[PDB]
Amino acid sequence: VSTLIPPKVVSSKNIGSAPNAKRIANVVHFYKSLPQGPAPAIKANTRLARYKAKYFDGDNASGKPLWHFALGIIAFGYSMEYYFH
Amino acid sequence: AKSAANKLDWAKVISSLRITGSTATQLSSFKKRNDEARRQLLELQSQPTEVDFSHYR
């Protein structure tokens, strides 16, 4: 009809409602993120925890970490047979 | 200097990737261009708004 403001209508809606939702998820995701792998908390030792944080730790995760249980139970069971048999 | 007056709109159309879809701004640009075209037509085709009374009478 006459003059208007075709571009200035970005007030009524920002570009990309789906991109806006994605970016809003991105802001919460990236902001509420550790600076560089923060909050590790690996070490622990209290009676059994000295074995948990050492033997159930994934630095090795080899076969001996489970085999310690077998060796210990064998130590218990040999005395069990000695007191039993 | 009517080049500059439409130069801004030409540049906008060059960058209207976010402004593409102007439903009633291109119509306004058409109205502005039609006004200039009719103005140039009145200037060129129509003679002086006067009378050649010096000799014609």
d(CA B16, CA B10): 9
* A4 at B interface, C-beta within 8 A: yes
Q: Tell me which chain A residues have a C-beta less than 8 angstroms from the C-beta of B23.
A: 6
Q: Residue B25: how many CB atoms within 10 A of its CB?
A: 19
Q: Which residues contact A55 (CB under 8 A, 6 or more apart)?
A: A65, A68
User: Residue A7 gets which letter from DSSP?
Assistant: G
Is there a contact between B2 and B36 (Cβ–Cβ < 8 Å)? yes
Experimental structure resolution, Å:
4.2
d(CA B42, CA B34): 12
Please answer yes or no on whether B24 and A10 come within 8 Å at the CB atom: no
Experimental approach was cryo-EM
Look at residue A45 and give its three-state secondary structure.
Answer: coil
d(CA A4, CA B22): 10
Give the residue from B6, B31, B15 showing the smallest Cα distance to A4: B31
Please answer yes or no on whether B24 and A7 come within 8 Å at the CB atom: no
Dump the DSSP string for B2-54: HHHHHHHHHHHHHTTTTTTT-TTTHHHHHHHHHHHHHHHHHHHTS--SS--TT
d(CA B6, CA A84): 105
Q: Please report the sign of the dihedral spanned by the C-alpha atoms of residue A45, residue A49, residue A55, residue A56.
A: negative
φ, ψ for residue A57, nearest 5 deg: -85, 145
* B16 at A interface, C-beta within 8 A: yes
Is there a contact between A28 and B54 (Cβ–Cβ < 8 Å)? no
User: Residue A9 gets which letter from DSSP?
Assistant: G
Please give, rounded to a whole number of angstroms, the shortest distance from the CA of B42 to a CA of chain A.
Answer: 22
CA angle B21, B22, B23 (to 5 degrees): 100
Shortest CA distance from B21: residue in chain A: A6
* A10 at B interface, C-beta within 8 A: yes
